[PDB]
Amino acid sequence: GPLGSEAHLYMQVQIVAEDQFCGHQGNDMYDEEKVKYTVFKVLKNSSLAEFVQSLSQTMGFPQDQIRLWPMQARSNGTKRPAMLDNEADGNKTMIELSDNENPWTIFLETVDPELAASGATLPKFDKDHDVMLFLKMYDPKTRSLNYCGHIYTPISCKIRDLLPVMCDRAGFIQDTSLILYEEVKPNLTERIQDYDVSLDKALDELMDGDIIVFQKDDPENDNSELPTAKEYFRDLYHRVDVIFCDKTIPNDPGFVVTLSNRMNYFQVAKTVAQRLNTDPMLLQFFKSQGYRDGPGNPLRHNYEGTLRDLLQFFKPRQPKKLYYQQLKMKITDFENRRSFKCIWLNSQFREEEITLYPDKHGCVRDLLEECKKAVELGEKASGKLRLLEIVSYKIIGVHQEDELLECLSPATSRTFRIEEIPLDQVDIDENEMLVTVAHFHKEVFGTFGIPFLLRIGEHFREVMKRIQSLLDIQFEKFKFAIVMMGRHQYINEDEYENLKDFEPQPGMSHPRPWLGLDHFN
């Protein structure tokens, strides 16, 4: 197998009965993915007569009680029943008549089963002089379409004389005043301005399978949200049901919101904000793909496209799904956040990588405030944070809170560290100053580990002991050096005791000298 050797000789013919036309709410006769067909697997090269008998027997109708009107497409995209001569074209074969359509859909007309009792012949129909029209009634109150069947009429017939049949089929008295529209194609519903005209003249390109939609001309209709059929169809054309799914909870079933093609961001957001009883500005939406399955990129609030634009990557088959996320601040604030990767130095003196999101137009104070939120600050401490700029495991700076985050280097050789200020280092005095410190192995530029700030000048060995307490090693080695411009002097850890050695000798302000700690790894 699997495909059998004769499978090619066969084509598929899809019969559709008039019952399938009933209660269709859209354009044309039926919806292609909802309609129930009676399907035949017929020999391609076989004739129409053969098929009409086969069909006649299968469906239980005499042949003089059925007429086949193939469903054919039009240039403008619609698909309507078209005339086919069941006796002139009967000699021909099925792919011929089909024009190689596979599958081929045919509308099967039969006789009003009541009158089918009598042995009712199906009315004669002249291919050149008559037309078969379909009737739909539009009801504003329920905003719905009610199928009213089809009629054979001469094309010479004046539209006025069609009115009684339309009433009779809708359920109306004969005094009932009507509005008549031609359903031409989606988004085109044309009012018949004048009913004292022949069909031939009144409608451009009069054709079998044409549709007249009609409604009551009752002043009540103005209370409907869609008073006329024209408004109904125009609404339909832009209607679109969209699944909104929270990007916070994966495998969210989401909820379906009916919207318009036409809507802008403000309108969409406004609509999905109700149904959540949340503010629209407290929602962030995301662009999409459709097959690739998003959520794509965050969609800006200043967005200026329509909803049709966001769903242009959907094929008509796929169900439309847009992702969203609930917010805690106004969307515009959230959008103006900046990603700030940096290092937090906990109370336990260890490093953690943390990303904070202060405001783009923020200053250092703000970044600090943000950090204080993500971290426990150690008990009985100081409660005050500072920001350091670090290069090569050396503190090359301490930033003031005033400073706009805008100014700080985007450079990635640079490393920003946020730390709690030890208690001693804020009620600091002349007799007192803060100095930069760093590890290094062998030569002074082989720096490593974690730099830090310290109290500097009337001793030493207890410095070594306090630095011991801070570092918490166990270190008997480790030489100690002051490091200034192109030079560094080691420190006698038994005898040495300092001053304000640590400052630019008058000849230039920075880089300030530092104290270095010489040992391995």
Swiss-Prot record:
Modified residues (N6-acetyllysine): 315
Coiled-coil ranges per UniProt: none
PTM: Isoform 1: Phosphorylated. Isoform 2: Not phosphorylated. Isoform 1: Polyneddylated. Isoform 2: Not Polyneddylated.
Induction cue: Up-regulated in regulatory T-cells (Treg). Down-regulated during neural progenitor cell differentiation.
Tissue-by-tissue expression: Expressed in neural progenitor cells (at protein level). Widely expressed. Overexpressed in prostate cancer.
Residue numbers bearing the Phosphoserine modification: 409
Residue segments, region Interaction with ICP0/VMW110: 68-247
Crosslinked positions (Glycyl lysine isopeptide (Lys-Gly) (interchain with G-Cter in SUMO2)): 315, 328
Membrane-traversing stretches: none
Compartment(s) where it occurs, according to its Swiss-Prot or TrEMBL record: Nucleus; Cytoplasm; Nucleus, PML body; Chromosome
Crosslink feature (Glycyl lysine isopeptide (Lys-Gly) (interchain with G-Cter in ubiquitin)) location: 315
Free-text function comment from the UniProt entry: Hydrolase that deubiquitinates target proteins such as ARMC5, FOXO4, DEPTOR, KAT5, p53/TP53, MDM2, ERCC6, DNMT1, UHRF1, PTEN, KMT2E/MLL5 and DAXX. Together with DAXX, prevents MDM2 self-ubiquitination and enhances the E3 ligase activity of MDM2 towards p53/TP53, thereby promoting p53/TP53 ubiquitination and proteasomal degradation. Deubiquitinates p53/TP53, preventing degradation of p53/TP53, and enhances p53/TP53-dependent transcription regulation, cell growth repression and apoptosis. (Microbial infection) Contributes to the overall stabilization and trans-activation capability of the herpesvirus 1 trans-acting transcriptional protein ICP0/VMW110 during HSV-1 infection.
Record text on subunit structure and interactions: Monomer. Homodimer. Part of a complex with DAXX, MDM2, RASSF1 and USP7. Part of a complex with DAXX, MDM2 and USP7. Interacts with MDM2; the interaction is independent of p53/TP53. Interacts with DAXX; the interaction is direct and independent of MDM2 and p53/TP53. Component of a complex composed of KMT2E/MLL5 (isoform 3), OGT (isoform 1) and USP7; the complex stabilizes KMT2E/MLL5, preventing KMT2E/MLL5 ubiquitination and proteasomal-mediated degradation. Interacts (via MATH domain) with KMT2E/MLL5 isoform 3. Interacts with OGT isoform 1. (Microbial infection) Isoform 1 and isoform 2 interact with herpesvirus 1 trans-acting transcriptional protein ICP0/VMW110. Binding to ICP0/VMW110 may modulate the substrate specificity or activity of USP7 to stabilize viral proteins.
Domain notes: The C-terminus plays a role in its oligomerization.
Disease field: Hao-Fountain syndrome: An autosomal dominant neurodevelopmental disorder characterized by global developmental delay, varying degrees of intellectual disability, autism spectrum disorder, poor or absent speech, and mild facial dysmorphism. Most patients develop seizures. Additional variable features include hypotonia, hypogonadism in males, and ocular anomalies.
Family: Belongs to the peptidase C19 family.
Protein name stated in the entry: Ubiquitin carboxyl-terminal hydrolase 7
Species this chain originates from: Homo sapiens
Gene symbol of the encoding locus: USP7
Parent-record interval covered: 560 to 1083 of 1102
